[PDB]
Amino acid sequence: AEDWLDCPALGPGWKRREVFRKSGATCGRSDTYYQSPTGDRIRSKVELTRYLGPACDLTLFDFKQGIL
DNA sequence: GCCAACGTTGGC
DNA sequence: GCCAACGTTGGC
| Domains of chain A, residue spans | 1-68
A41 touches strand C (CB under 7 A): no
Q: Which amino acid is at A7?
A: C
A65 touches strand C (CB under 7 A): no
Half-sphere exposure of A5 (CA within 13 A, CB side): 12
Query: At what resolution in Å was this solved?
Result: 2.2
Helix (H) or strand (E) holding A52: helix A45-52
- Please give the method by which this entry was determined: X-ray
C-alpha A63 chain-centroid distance? 6
- Looking across all nucleic acid strands, the nucleotide with the smallest C1' to CA distance from residue A26 is B6
- Using CA atoms, how far apart are residues A58 and A68, in angstroms rounded to an integer? 8
- Using CA atoms, how far apart are residues A67 and A53, in angstroms rounded to an integer? 19
For domain A1-68, is the CATH number 3.40.640.10? Answer: no
